[PDB]
Structures are given as structure tokens and as C-alpha cells.
């Protein structure tokens, strides 16, 4: 069973805007998580073939990852902060759906999520 195509990261016909919140989401929220010691499972789409997880995409129908988010912000794909916040939340939730409580990745996701929630709690006014 193969991997799906990655999520789209640009669309040349979408409108573009740069807002306070979108800047913060790339420069503060994504930056912080991306440079963290636990970012690496989350920096690219899950390759279920190379990572030997053949049921991954039987279970996870809305994949998401921070490499995709990073490119969506750099490309001005998002119009609203909430689109980006939703993507982060999808990413974390997928991890919690798929992986078992003993797995290190679960606690790594919990730690990153907590950082994420701190930074989103400080989302600058719109
Ligand atoms: C930090 N340094 C020391 C080592 C880094 N290398 C270890 C071997 N590599 C690796 N090893 C993955 N799984 C194996 C594994 C072994 C031990 C611990 C953990 Cl958390 C994961 C792995 C798992 C995933 C993965 C699996 C399920 C899932 O829901 N998500 C979101 C991500 C992604 C990349 C992955 N890279 C390439 C990177």
C-alpha cells in the first residue's frame, strides 16, 4: 500500500496576504517547534513504506505534517490563522490516533503540543 500524494503546499490562483498572525505562525510558532529536539518525526509527510507502517493510510485519512505547514506559510497558502492552527492540530491528533501509549513519539507529540499551545495562547491581536 502506497503513500498518498503529499498535501498541496501552494496554489498560484489563491489570493495572498501577510498578516501579523500569519507572520507569528511562521516566525514564532512553526520556528519554535521546528528547531525543537523532537521536531524530526514531524518535519515531513509520513512515509509509511520506508517507516514500515503499512496500515498508516488505512487509518489516517487526513495526513498533515510540519514540513507541509512550513511550506504553506512560506508560500502564502493560508489566508486565516485558523487554517494553520487546524493543520497543527490535525498533525498532533493523527499521531495520537496511530501510535500507542508506550511509543516515544507519543510523549514527543505531547511535549511539542504543549509548546504549540503556549505559543498559540500568545497569538498576537488580528
Ligand atoms: C533523533 N535521532 C537520534 C534519530 C533520528 N532518526 C531515527 C530513524 N528515523 C526515523 N525513525 C522513525 N521511527 C523510528 C523511531 C525509533 C525510536 C524512537 C522514535 Cl520516536 C522513532 C520515524 C517515525 C516517524 C513517524 C512515525 C509515526 C508517526 O505518526 N509520525 C508522525 C512520524 C517519522 C520519521 C521517523 N524517522 C530517521 C531519524
Curated annotation (Swiss-Prot):
Position(s), cross-link Glycyl lysine isopeptide (Lys-Gly) (interchain with G-Cter in SUMO2): 58
Effect seen on changing residue 104 to G: Found in a patient with a neurodevelopmental syndrome; uncertain significance
Expressing tissues: Ubiquitously expressed.
Coiled-coil region list: none
Subcellular location: Nucleus; Chromosome
Chain positions of site Acetylated histone binding: 99
Modification after translation: Phosphorylation by CK2 disrupt the intramolecular binding between the bromo domain 2 and the NPS region and promotes binding between the NPS and the BID regions, leading to activate the protein and promote binding to acetylated histones. In absence of phosphorylation, BRD4 does not localize to p53/TP53 target gene promoters, phosphorylation promoting recruitment to p53/TP53 target promoters.
Residue stretches making up the Bromo domain: 17-123
Entry's disease: Cornelia de Lange syndrome 6: A form of Cornelia de Lange syndrome, a clinically heterogeneous developmental disorder associated with malformations affecting multiple systems. It is characterized by facial dysmorphisms, abnormal hands and feet, growth delay, cognitive retardation, hirsutism, gastroesophageal dysfunction and cardiac, ophthalmologic and genitourinary anomalies. CDLS6 inheritance is autosomal dominant. A chromosomal aberration involving BRD4 is found in a rare, aggressive, and lethal carcinoma arising in midline organs of young people. Translocation t(15;19)(q14;p13) with NUTM1 which produces a BRD4-NUTM1 fusion protein.
Misc note: JQ1, a thieno-triazolo-1,4-diazepine derivative, and I-BET, a benzodiazepine derivative, have been tested on tumors with success. Treatment with GSK1210151A (I-BET151, a I-BET derivative) has strong effets on mixed lineage leukemia and promotes myeloid differentiation and leukemia stem-cell depletion.
Function recorded in the entry: Chromatin reader protein that recognizes and binds acetylated histones and plays a key role in transmission of epigenetic memory across cell divisions and transcription regulation. Remains associated with acetylated chromatin throughout the entire cell cycle and provides epigenetic memory for postmitotic G1 gene transcription by preserving acetylated chromatin status and maintaining high-order chromatin structure. During interphase, plays a key role in regulating the transcription of signal-inducible genes by associating with the P-TEFb complex and recruiting it to promoters.
Family: Belongs to the BET family.
Assembly information from the UniProt record: Interacts with p53/TP53; the interaction is direct. Interacts (via CTD region) with CDK9 and CCNT1, acting as an associated component of P-TEFb complex. Interacts with RELA (when acetylated at 'Lys-310'). Interacts (via NET domain) with NSD3, CHD4, BICRA and ATAD5. The interaction with BICRA bridges BRD4 to the GBAF complex. Interacts (via NET domain) with JMJD6 (via JmjC and N-terminal domains); the interaction is stronger in presence of ssRNA and recruits JMJD6 on distal enhancers. Interacts with NSD3. Interacts with NIPBL.
Domain comment (free text): The NET domain mediates interaction with a number of chromatin proteins involved in transcription regulation (NSD3, JMJD6, CHD4, GLTSCR1 and ATAD5).
Listed name of the protein: Bromodomain-containing protein 4
Native organism: Homo sapiens
